[PDB]
Structures are given as C-alpha cells and as structure tokens.
Amino acid sequence: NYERFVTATSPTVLLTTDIAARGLDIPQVDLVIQHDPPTDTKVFIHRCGRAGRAGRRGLSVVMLQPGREEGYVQLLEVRQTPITPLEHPQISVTDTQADDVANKIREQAKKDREVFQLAQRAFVSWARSYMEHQATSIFRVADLDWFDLAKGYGLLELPKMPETR
RNA sequence: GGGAAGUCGGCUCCGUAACUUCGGGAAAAGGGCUCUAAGGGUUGGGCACGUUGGGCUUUGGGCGGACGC
Numbered sequence A: 001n002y003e004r005f006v007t008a009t010s011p012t013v014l015l016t017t018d019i020a021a022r023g024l025d026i027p028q029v030d031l032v033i034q035h036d037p038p039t040d041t042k043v044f045i046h047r048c049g050r051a052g053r054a055g056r057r058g059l060s061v062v063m064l065q066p067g068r069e070e071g072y073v074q075l076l077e078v079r080q081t082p083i084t085p086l087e088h089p090q091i092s093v094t095d096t097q098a099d100d101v102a103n104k105i106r107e108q109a110k111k112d113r114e115v116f117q118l119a120q121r122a123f124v125s126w127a128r129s130y131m132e133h134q135a136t137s138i139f140r141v142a143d144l145d146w147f148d149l150a151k152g153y154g155l156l157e158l159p160k161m162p163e164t165r
Numbered sequence B: 001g002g003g004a005a006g007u008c009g010g011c012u013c014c015g016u017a018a019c020u021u022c023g024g025g026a027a028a029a030g031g032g033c034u035c036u037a038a039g040g041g042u043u044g045g046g047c048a049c050g051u052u053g054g055g056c057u058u059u060g061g062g063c064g065g066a067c068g069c
C-alpha cells in the first residue's frame, strides 16, 4: 500500500493514522487535512510538516468543531506557532444538501452487511481516543453532541456505550 | 448505741451505632486509542475463442498374422 503510493501517477489520497505523520519525505505533496485534532500537541507540528518539504508550496488545514475546541487556536498561539483563519477558497460549507450527500453512506450501510460493525467499531474507538486527549481543559467528553457525530459518521444506530440517551 | 469519749501514745464482660478479608487484575463500563516484533501451521484465483495432446464417432493400414477346424 505504501509502495503503490510513492510511484503513483494519479491524484491519489492516503487515509492514515499517526504512522505517516513524522519525518516523511514523500515527494510532490501539497495538501494535508486533519480530520481530528491531535491527541498530543507535538504531533500537530510534525503533522503539518508533511506538506511543505523544501519550498514546494503546501496547504495545511485542520477541521475543528464549534465550542471549546475553537479555543484550541490560542493553545497553539502561546506555544510557538501562530494560527490564522483560512484565506482561499472562502466558501465555508455546503448546507443540508451536503447532509443529503452525508446520509448517502448510511445507504450502503444498509446495502453491505460487513460495513455495519465496521461503522460501529470505528465510531466507538473514536470515543475511546477522545478521553485520552491530554487537553483536559479544551476537549470534554461531556460537551459534545453525539447526534451530530452519528450523522457525521453515518451511524445507523448508536451502540450500547455508557452515555444513556 | 458512743466512735479514742481509754491511754503520753489507733491509722474485664453484655447491649447499641459506623469501619474492616483472601485471590486475580494498568489503561470506557461491566462493538473500545497512537507506535513499537510476536499474535499457530496446511491448502486455496474467474470468464471465451482459434490453438497442443489424450479424450466422442468416422476412415485405413500393417503388427497380432492369431484361435479353432
């Protein structure tokens, strides 16, 4: 899977964990996107650095949720690194017709049987990784809307995980 | 009865109210993070055509040249 990416002649994209997040000189790389905030802060600086290797203009972008994780920006600011809002493109998000794109993955959740427990197990491991976050003042396991996550991950039904609803 | 009035000279257990042991076990509770090794062995890649031979008839030869009379 690695060897097919380095000699790839197509606009490919890799979905990885923190394996490919440190010291990697992969040539002709431009975009890096953070779905999750890092579980530890030093990983962020190495995570952005997988875009702009020796000149070669690189875009680094991290998605965050509304709430106290908007306060994560000044966490970076005081440490050493400034953070600025995005500049281009300025189009923010597409509305609930993108939910009509987002709910599409719940359709193949019905179609394919194997993706069902794949959907659950991915979601709940995400919850386990949340309370391991070192920023106990920024990311809370209480101040998050589980329905918004379930719509985001396209969960068919919430698992029997210990937050009663 | 008096009280030295003699004479120098008498001094742990029962009932009631809270708390406690041994063993195993680090990481949500009782489908659950990152990375670093290892995480039992064996056997397993599709669909057609013209093509190779044996494999289904047909067409022939000799070898057997028999067996018995």
Ligand SMILES: [Mg+2]
Residues within 6 Å of the ligand: A022, A023, A024
């Ligand atoms: Mg390096």
